[PDB]
């Protein structure tokens, strides 16, 4: 393998390359589910059987 | 809740979705509230087909 | 892919997965640093298997 290693080469890469800002979006994860989900699960199980 | 099917669509989407979906669409709205469509160029990646 | 300047990168993970995912991303960033520095410092004269 070979690659550019010098700082001037690094900035030259930054001319066409970019290090985008990396951020997060956390969300609250819950486990409860609705009843109609249970109904449809039962229907699909009947269909599968 | 109400009769206005547009804001009702917004409201049900906010309400009939997992916190993950709500949060993602929230971030999507806030990031591109009223910018020029030309000025924005974004991708979204998801796993399943 | 976010190859433009001032590019914004967004991630979505569950609250329960926050520590695991952030540790994984630190693993990834440190792996990037490791590959970069090991390639830089590692000097081989033969340059051929």
């Amino acid at each position: 393998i070979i690659t550019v290693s010098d700082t001037k080469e690094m900035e030259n890469v930054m001319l066409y390359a970019t290090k985008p800002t990396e951020v997060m979006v956390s969300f609250p994860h819950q486990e409860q589910v609705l009843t109609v989900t249970r109904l449809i699960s039962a229907e699909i199980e009947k269909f599968y059987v | 809740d109400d009769d206005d099917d547009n804001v009702n669509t917004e409201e049900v989407i906010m309400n009939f979705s997992t916190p993950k979906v709500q949060r993602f669409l929230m971030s999507l709205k806030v990031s591109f509230a009223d910018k020029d469509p030309k000025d924005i160029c974004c991708l979204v990646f998801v796993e399943r087909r | 892919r976010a190859r433009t300047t001032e590019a914004k990168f967004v991630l979505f993970t569950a609250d329960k997965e926050r520590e695991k995912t952030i540790q994984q991303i630190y693993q990834y960033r440190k792996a990037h640093n490791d590959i970069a520095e090991y390639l830089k410092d590692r000097v081989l004269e033969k340059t051929e298997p």
């Binding site: 990396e22 979006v25 969300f27 819950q30 | 906010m14 929230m26 971030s27 | 991630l11 952030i22």
Partner: peptide, 16 residues
């Protein structure tokens, strides 16, 4: 339950 939980308006794109 007939209800999913909302999420607050105040989130910020915490640096990761």
């Amino acid at each position: 339950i007939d209800r999913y939980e909302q999420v607050s308006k105040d989130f910020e794109f915490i640096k990761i």
